[PDB]
Design a protein around this ligand. Structure first.
Ligand code: M4H
Ligand code: MG
Ligand code: MG
Ligand code: MG
Lengths: 48, 221, 740, 179, 60
RNA sequence: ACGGACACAU
RNA sequence: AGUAGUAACAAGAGCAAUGUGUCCGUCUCUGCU
């Protein structure tokens, strides 16, 4: 279910998944930063 | 009002406010003071979290611009998105799951935060909010336009500068509601419909037993 | 780590059409665009598979087969071919590739099939270690009813099990809802610990858990046992004319055995009272009866079942009685008083006509089990006084709903709001007393303000409960108080000693009449396990539909023997023990009035020659299995209790119960052919009749040379030499003379 | 023997047999009497008290929680944007696409009743703009039978429906023979 | 069961001639409005749309 | 939940 | 011609509803003892 778009749902899920993985020690800080910057690049495209 | 809110708040705050009003099924021009109150709640929820980081050593810092945020912002997102966030957090930190959707989550103190913004007294709305939220280990924080804020159990996890900046912004917004006159309607404002458009109304009028000229006359009969 | 999917999403967002779709389609609209199909629809897969298997390559598989399966068989078959495109991730595959993999592919040490499909291996273990008895041939009376094809978990319903499955398999996707049971929580923690480090796909895990936890039902025609392990072999165990005796492999279920012990107890109790020694027959039947191929008296020495008819079977043998009955699962133990049951036609709260069964008579109660206690003073439709106890404050509030359903006054029967159908979707009669129970559990505001208040005196040791949830010390509801310590244990949970007599009334060493046979609930449930009353006092399978057919089936084949007993010394014929289980279908006050009518009909067939109807002697004969009365009243039909519904049986002509068929030359009972009586139609089909009316002779069809018409009840003031026209029943009139 | 009228919106000839002359033989008739229908429904309500209210409450609870994708449960649906049958999910996706291209964005909430509000609001649109499947024919030679055949190539094309044409398509039931 | 013994009982095995062609959407409109009597008027207007649309239908 | 097959009525 | 049957195929675009129930599943060849 949902009213947000598929892309917003995917980016929100990717951000919270990377944050929970960084809290649980299952990824590194560089991987967390690279996932968050990939999400910011996708949002830079999605703005246009 | 309408143009007051669109001249006073940031475009992202108004964007999330418009998306929130649309998700709850109401245009911003039909409810203008509710749009202003929603933009107020969103702006306080964003000033609670902006430039507030946790470093690699677990110590909260305040910046201007290799850091991770201290707060996860749950107010503003869609409802199932926010429940995905809340469920993932409750499954990592194995706590109880809140019954209502909160507004923030603090990773440092590991606590869900609820933010209220009032025009009335702080303590009455605070006790009604603590009665509505009775049964959960949330942290309530009520801010007012008057310049007072109430915490939960007189404990503070935010510092002095950020809370003073929130109260400064709320005092400036309250005085801005006075000079354009729209504080009388603001401070004193706290079902399904299905109509027929005119072409379908004429189609309805032509769909009856032959002794009826109106669909509503037949519905009354 | 999650970097690949965000890189792939970046790659897809860089395409313009994909970005427009991902930014304009919501999650709700993705359910619509997921099923978008623009080609022509493929129809007829049976015909298509018939001709596609003549081709070389009917199978489409992924391109990884090019690395796993060679292009050439040892026999020289081509196993796969590349498609007409260039960069397709899909190859066309011959079924010889499937045979090559099954004979020469990589052997795996890890197979997942016995864990995912553990339900079917449970089924095969039940069949392989099962035992077959003989096959008996008789008319199977199946009844269509809702049974379980998957038993599910006992602690869960279907929706609770689906929410447990979502919490176990996909815990971060459950949304707003939580798990609202402690049983859900324990099953969820158990399944989460069981399914750690599983390399199975999560959807297959979810379907495996649905095979384990979700209860499925279907409407099926069942003749025997209805537990879920006897329903899976329903194709093997029953047919239209035969029954295969089968015991499944393994240990039986406890709640299934607890139910079918009660049903087998009530049959043996109800059969026994229409014997000449109701104790010696009950002991003869209890020692031979078996449940799921296990003897009854070995079950009656280890079962904690507290029921009224079970207690007669134990007090006859010598097992000690834990005297209580169960509503809602609580021990409803009586103290003092005595009642008797007789149903009536009362009205309910949703304006529906209901046939309730209300216990008329004073009964003192000590109702207590596992959470609280209650001492209910109660008579006829009157909750007088209930000093109810508890352990926690909230568990008294739910048991307050429990007692006020059992009260059944003229207040709770008319304080029902909502929709409470006492029938189901197949017009099947649900029992009423459990339907008010499951309804008032969450709708309780109509049972707290219609009940009112009653004034009380300030005595210590007593608390109160208001309508609005207030504990009080000045006023409270009618007949309900609140205590603190209550009544202690080891007096309800002691199995006391008793003694039985010749007529099964169970009294203790003091002389409290604790069980009488008149207090046995005369309901016919369907059992979860089969019951073999291997006795000469019963029939093969019990049931009110089976007692009707088997009795008439026995008179028809023994008709050459029974007609001679009917002709001379007829009272030896009426006293047959084959005729005795038929009397459990007749109501109690109707038995002596029916035999007195029937034997009076049978005597007029003898004193008037030529009026011998062998088809009507057969029909009336198992209604004479009782000492008669001298009540000269007229009957047009005899009622018969089958599943609560009183079926009528007409003295003259066919019915839905006893239908003679001239075309087949047969008697049809309840839709089951029970055999040709004697085939003596030419000696039969007379004119004068004598076994329809009491003291009257039907003389042919209707004729108005004698005056007006009468009815069956209005023939009391007649005389000698006087004929008349009477509506005989079923839309016709006959000339009728009251004889000398 | 009923009344004939011309529809003001579609322009069609409509026959009204309701409350018509009572039949005088045993032929099939369509002259149903509205008062007798209302009397029978009133008797059904009288013999079943609380039936209509319970059923209406269940329908009210189900209206508010029904999504648009429930309409994808169907089989072959008449697609008014193509004047042809399509599968139900395809037909719904084409309808939602044409609606949101024309400014009917209530169905973006995902509830079925907002889609129904958009369906009723689209009849006021004076000019619908839909996407149609056209074809481009070309005479080629078949390579395995040496016979000149016609190559059909389907593309998309945007047309403008009128108000009456859209209203006729929105009330159109496509027909076929039951096999 | 709901019969006395002085009663004939006959069963019709019945079909109806041209069932769908002799039904009427205006009668369905009256049925829907009487079933939903005393209900919210948005609900009565929503449930009336399908008989109104079937009263004005065309057949391709 | 979704899909397929079959039956029946329209 | 033939299949067929209220209209078609005999090559040159293959037109599958609604409601209910039951059952199953989860992406260059032709050989039935
Ligand atoms: O949405 C929440 O979680 C939330 C909502 N408010 C109420 C307001 N509000 C915002 C969106 C919304 C939707 C429906 C009803 N009230 C809504 C915010 C200001 C004006 C009303 C207050 C809190 O403190 C919350 O935490
Ligand atoms: Mg909020
Ligand atoms: Mg808030
Ligand atoms: Mg018909």
């Amino acid at each position: 279910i949902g009213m947000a778009s598929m892309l917003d749902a995917m980016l929100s899920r990717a951000r919270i998944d990377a944050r929970i993985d960084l809290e649980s020690g299952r990824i590194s800080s560089q991987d967390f930063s690279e996932i968050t910057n990939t999400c910011k690049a996708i949002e830079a495209l999605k703005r246009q | 009002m309408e143009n007051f809110v669109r001249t006073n708040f940031n475009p992202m705050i108004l964007e999330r406010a418009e998306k929130t009003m649309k998700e709850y099924g109401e245009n911003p021009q039909n409810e203008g003071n509710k749009f202003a109150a929603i933009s107020t709640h969103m702006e306080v929820c964003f000033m609670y979290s902006d430039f507030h980081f946790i470093d690699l050593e677990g110590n909260t810092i305040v910046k201007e611009n290799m850091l991770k945020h201290r707060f996860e912002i749950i107010e503003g997102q869609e409802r199932n998105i926010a429940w995905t966030i809340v469920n993932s957090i409750c499954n990592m930190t194995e706590n109880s799951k809140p019954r209502f959707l909160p507004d923030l989550y603090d990773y440092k103190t590991n606590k869900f935060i609820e933010i209220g913004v009032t025009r009335r007294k702080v303590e009455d709305y605070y006790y009604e909010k603590a009665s509505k939220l009775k049964g959960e280990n949330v942290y309530i924080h009520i801010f007012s336009f008057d310049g007072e804020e109430m915490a939960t159990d007189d404990e503070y996890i935010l510092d002095e500068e950020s809370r003073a900046r929130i109260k400064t912004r709320l005092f400036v917004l309250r005085q801005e509601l006075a000079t354009a006159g729209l504080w009388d309607s603001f401070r004193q404002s706290e079902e399904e419909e299905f109509s027929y458009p005119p072409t379908f109304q004429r189609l309805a009028n032509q769909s009856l037993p032959p002794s009826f000229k109106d669909y509503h006359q037949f519905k009354a009969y | 780590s999650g970097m690949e999917r965000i890189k792939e999403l970046m790659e897809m967002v860089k395409n313009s059409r994909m970005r427009e779709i991902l930014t304009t389609t919501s999650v709700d609209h993705m359910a619509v665009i997921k099923k978008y199909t623009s080609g022509r629809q493929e129809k007829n897969p049976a015909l298509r598979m018939k001709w596609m298997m003549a081709m070389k390559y009917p199978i489409s598989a992924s391109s990884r087969i090019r690395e796993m399966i060679p292009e050439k068989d040892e026999d020289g078959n081509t196993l796969w071919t590349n498609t007409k495109d260039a960069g397709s991730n899909r190859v066309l595959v011959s079924p010889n590739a499937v045979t090559w993999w099954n004979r020469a592919g990589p052997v795996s040490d890890v197979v997942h099939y016995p864990r995912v499909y553990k339900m079917y291996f449970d089924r095969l273990e039940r069949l392989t270690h099962g035992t077959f008895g003989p096959v008996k041939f008789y008319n199977q009376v199946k009844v269509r009813k809702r049974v379980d094809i998957n038993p599910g978990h006992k602690d869960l319903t279907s929706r609770e099990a689906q929410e447990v499955i979502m919490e176990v398999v996909f815990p971060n996707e459950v949304g707003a809802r939580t798990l609202s049971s402690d049983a859900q929580l324990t099953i969820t923690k158990e399944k989460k610990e069981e399914l750690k480090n599983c390399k199975i796909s999560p959807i297959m895990v979810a379907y495996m858990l649905e095979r384990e936890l979700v209860r499925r039902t279907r409407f099926l025609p069942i003749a025997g046992a209805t537990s879920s392990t006897y329903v899976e072999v329903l194709h093997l165990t029953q047919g239209t004319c035969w029954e295969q005796q089968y015991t499944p492999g393994g240990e039986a279920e406890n709640d299934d055995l607890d139910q079918t012990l009660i049903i087998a107890s009530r049959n043996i109790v109800r059969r026994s009272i229409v014997a000449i020694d109701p104790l010696a027959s009950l002991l003869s039947m209890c020692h031979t009866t078996s449940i799921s191929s296990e003897p009854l008296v070995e079950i009656l020495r280890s079962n904690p079942t507290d029921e009224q008819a079970v207690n007669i079977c134990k007090a006859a043998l010598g097992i000690r009685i834990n005297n209580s009955f169960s509503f809602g699962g609580y021990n409803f133990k009586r103290v003092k008083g005595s009642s008797q049951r007789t149903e009536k036609a009362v009205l309910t709260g949703n304006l529906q006509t209901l046939t309730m069964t209300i216990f008329e008579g004073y009964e003192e109660f000590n109702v207590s089990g596992k959470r609280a206690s209650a001492v209910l003073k109660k008579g006829a439709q009157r909750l007088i006084q209930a000093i109810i106890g508890g352990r926690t404050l909230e568990d008294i509030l739910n048991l307050m709903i429990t007692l006020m359903v059992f009260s059944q006054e003229e207040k709770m029967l008319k304080a029902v709001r909502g929709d409470l159908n006492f029938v189901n979707r197949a017009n099947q009669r649900l029992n009423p007393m459990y339907q008010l129970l499951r309804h008032f559990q969450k709708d309780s505001s109509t049972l707290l303000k219609n009940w009112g208040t009653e004034e009380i005196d300030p005595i210590m040791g007593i608390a109160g409960i208001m309508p609005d949830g207030t504990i009080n010390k000045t006023q409270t509801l009618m007949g309900v108080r609140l205590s603190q310590g209550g009544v202690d244990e080891y007096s309800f949970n002691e199995r006391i000693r008793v003694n039985i007599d010749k007529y099964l009334r169970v009294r203790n060493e003091k002389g409290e009449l604790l069980i009488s046979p008149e207090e046995v609930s005369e309901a016919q449930g369907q059992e979860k396990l089969p019951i073999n009353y291997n006795s000469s006092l019963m029939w093969e399978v019990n049931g009110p539909e089976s007692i009707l057919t088997n009795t008439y089936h026995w008179i028809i084949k023994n008709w050459e023997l029974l007609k001679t007993q009917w002709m001379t010394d007829p009272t030896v014929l009426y006293n047959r023990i084959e005729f005795e289980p038929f009397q459990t279908l007749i109501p109690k006050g109707n038995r002596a009035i029916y035999s007195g009518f029937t034997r009076t009909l049978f005597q007029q067939m003898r004193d008037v020659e030529g009026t011998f109807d062998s088809i009507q002697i057969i029909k009336l004969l198992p209604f004479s299995a009782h000492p008669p009365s001298l009540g000269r009243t007229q009957f047009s039909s005899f009622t018969l209790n089958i599943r609560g519904a009183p079926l009528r049986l007409l003295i003259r002509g066919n019915s839905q119960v006893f239908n003679y068929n001239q075309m087949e030359n047969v008697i049809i009972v309840l839709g089951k052919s029970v055999g040709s009586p004697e085939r003596s139609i030419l000696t039969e089909s007379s004119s004068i009749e004598s076994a329809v009316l009491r003291g009257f002779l039907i003389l042919g069809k209707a004729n108005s040379k004698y005056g007006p018409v009468l009815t069956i009840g209005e023939l009391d003031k007649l005389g000698r030499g006087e004929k008349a026209n009477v509506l005989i029943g079923q839309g016709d009139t006959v000339l009728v003379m009251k004889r000398k | 023997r009923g009344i004939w009228k011309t529809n003001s919106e579609t322009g069609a000839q409509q026959l009204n047999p309701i409350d018509g002359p009572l039949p005088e033989d045993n032929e099939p008739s369509g002259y149903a009497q509205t008062d007798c229908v209302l009397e029978l429904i009133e008797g059904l309500d009288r013999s079943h008290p609380g039936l209509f209210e319970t059923a209406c409450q269940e329908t009210i609870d189900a209206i508010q929680q029904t999504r648009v994708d429930k309409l994808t449960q169907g089989r072959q649906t008449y697609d008014w944007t193509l004047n042809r049958n399509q599968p139900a999910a395809t037909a719904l996706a084409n309808t939602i696409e044409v609606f949101r291209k024309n400014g009917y964005k209530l169905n973006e909430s995902g509830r079925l009743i907002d889609f129904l509000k958009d369906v009723l609001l689209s009849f006021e649109n004076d000019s619908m703009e839909v996407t149609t499947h056209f074809q481009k024919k070309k005479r080629i030679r078949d390579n395995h039978s040496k016979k000149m055949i016609t190559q059909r190539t389907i593309g998309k094309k945007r047309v403008k429906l009128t108000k009456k044409n859209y209203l006729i398509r929105a009330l159109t039931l496509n027909t076929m023979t039951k096999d | 069961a709901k019969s006395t013994d002085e009663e004939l009982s006959y069963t019709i095995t019945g079909d109806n001639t041209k069932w769908n062609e002799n039904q009427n959407p205006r009668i369905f409109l009256a049925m829907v409005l009487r079933i939903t009597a005393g209900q919210p008027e948005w609900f009565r207007d929503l449930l009336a749309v399908a008989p109104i649309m079937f009263s004005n239908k065309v057949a391709r």
